[PDB]
């Protein structure tokens, strides 16, 4: 497990991320001043829940598609048996979606890029899950503090997915080995770039876990009311 191997692992993970990032950070950053007007916000607030759910189901499934492709390009993932790939994605893909979202979050005015412009949490009231929406915003705000580089997001989201503790893995040893090498790669890269200090600012588990569980509960309610 050589220095050159760890360097190439950082490079491949970063490349996999660039190939599947959905939106370019430069585009997201240049759009920050493009904010929904008061009239456009009212427009969204007046939409039915049904309509907002159809819209947001589309955005969710699109985001998940990119995360699945990221995993499949990730060095070492395709070595796992199909069962274990499925276990890791079922457990981790939404978590990656939520982490990726901080790139599209502007902490200065607490807005997120959505359907072409930046809007705050009040844009989403018609969905009828106020707690969840503000939990998403709060999670994004907490990640915003780290000012992740694109390479750090790549490595961190790889580790969100490659977690040997997920229940139901058939080849736990295999996943442990992959995780061990990605952790070494992450920390090697942080020290190389003088960015170790972001580790102490990564958030407490209970936030995201609650978040993904909250999402799961609300998704089931939407599917009941309006199966897609
Ligand atoms: C912004 C989030 C919260 C408000 C609406 N929304 C999206 O539509 C959305 N967008 C995503 C994305 O990656 N887009 C890329 C970019 C950020 C650049 O715009 S991903 C996603 C998303 C959709 C639904 C849920 C639900 O849990 C909900 F709505 F309840 F919160 C579910 F409907 F599934 F139940 C959840 Cl959490 C999420 Cl994160």
Count Cβ neighbours within 10 Å for each residue of 144-182 and write b for 16 or more, e otherwise: bebebeebbbbbbbbbbbbbbebeebeeeebbebbbebb
Tell me the two tokens of residue 30: 């240049």
Number of the ligand 1 atom closest to the C-alpha atom of 94: 39
**DSSP structural state of residue 35:** B
Residue 112: CB atoms within 10 A of its CB come to 21
Return left, alpha or beta for 48; rule: phi > 0 is left, psi -120 to 50 is alpha, else beta: beta
Question: How far is residue 42's CA from residue 36's CA, in Å, rounded to a whole number?
Answer: 10
Q: Residues near 1 by Cβ (< 8 Å), separated by ≥ 6?
A: 181, 184
How many angstroms does the Cα of residue 112 sit away from the middle of ligand 1? 10
Of residues 219, 212, 198, the one with CA closest to residue 142: 198
Q: Resolution of the coordinates in A?
A: 1.6
Q: Which helix (H) or strand (E) holds 111?
A: strand 111-114
Tell me if 137 CB under 6 Å of ligand 1: no
Question: How far is residue 10's CA from residue 151's CA, in Å, rounded to a whole number?
Answer: 8
How was this structure determined? It was done by X-ray
Q: Which helix (H) or strand (E) holds 112?
A: strand 111-114
**DSSP structural state of residue 80:** S
Q: Evaluate whether 140 touches 101 at the Cβ level (below 8 Å).
A: yes
Number of the ligand 1 atom closest to the C-alpha atom of 63: 13
Q: Residues near 141 by Cβ (< 8 Å), separated by ≥ 6?
A: 105, 107, 110
Q: Evaluate whether 49 touches 128 at the Cβ level (below 8 Å).
A: yes
Tell me the two tokens of residue 216: 């799961």
Residue nearest to atom 1 of ligand 1 (CA): 114
Question: How far is residue 112's CA from residue 196's CA, in Å, rounded to a whole number?
Answer: 27
Q: Evaluate whether 201 touches 146 at the Cβ level (below 8 Å).
A: yes
Q: Residues near 190 by Cβ (< 8 Å), separated by ≥ 6?
A: 152, 196, 198, 199
Q: Does domain 1-228 have CATH number 1.10.565.10?
A: yes
Tell me if 88 CB under 6 Å of ligand 1: no
Q: Evaluate whether 60 touches 15 at the Cβ level (below 8 Å).
A: no
């Amino acid at each position: 497990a050589s220095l050159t191997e760890i360097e190439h692992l950082v490079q491949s993970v970063c490349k996999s991320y660039r190939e599947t990032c959905q939106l370019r950070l430069e585009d997201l950053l240049r759009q920050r001043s493009n904010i929904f007007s008061r009239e456009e916000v009212t427009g969204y607030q007046r939409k039915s829940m049904w309509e907002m759910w159809e819209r947001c189901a589309h955005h969710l499934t699109e985001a998940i598609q990119y995360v699945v492709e990221f995993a499949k390009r990730l060095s070492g993932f395709m070595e796992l048996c199909q069962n274990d790939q499925i276990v890791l994605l079922k457990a981790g893909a939404m978590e990656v979606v939520l982490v990726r979202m901080c790139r599209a979050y502007n902490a200065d005015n607490r807005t997120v890029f959505f359907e072409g412009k930046y809007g705050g949490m009040e844009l989403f009231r018609a969905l009828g899950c106020s707690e969840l929406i503000s939990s998403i915003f709060d999670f994004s705000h907490s990640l915003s503090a780290l000012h992740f580089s694109e390479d750090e997001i790549a490595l961190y989201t790889a580790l969100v997915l490659i977690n040997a503790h997920r229940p139901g893995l058939q080849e736990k040893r295999k996943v442990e080995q992959l995780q061990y090498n990605l952790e070494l790669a992450f920390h090697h890269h942080l020290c190389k770039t003088h960015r170790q200090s972001i580790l102490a600012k990564l958030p407490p588990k209970g936030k995201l876990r609650s978040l993904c569980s909250q999402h799961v509960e609300r998704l089931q309610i939407f599917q009941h009311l309006h199966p897609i």
